């Protein structure tokens, strides 16, 4: 019973951890892409001269 008590507070719920990791990876790829496009935001300024 005490081992179950420890599991209820200490062991990680794999089902939610996998989903959290997946969403984190998705956010990472999206962030890298949007950061790139933000880096080409000032490029349009380098058209008129």
């Amino acid at each position: 019973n005490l081992s179950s008590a420890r599991s209820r507070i200490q062991d990680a719920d794999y089902a939610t951890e996998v989903s959290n990791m997946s969403k984190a990876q998705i956010l990472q790829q999206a962030g890298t892409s949007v950061l790139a496009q933000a880096n080409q935001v000032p490029q349009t300024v380098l058209s008129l001269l």
Binding site: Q10, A24, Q28, L35, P42
Partner: protein
Amino acid sequence: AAVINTNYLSLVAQNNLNKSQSSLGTAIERLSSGLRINSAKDDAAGMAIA
């Protein structure tokens, strides 16, 4: 503004990327270790209970 010296959008994107990466880091640590409460900074009282 059409200025190039500083890019506020790039800075905001960097911040959100860092937040997502920190979430990924804690998720990866909890996935690898198999313990939700390690590095007590998450659920400090929980580690005392455990």
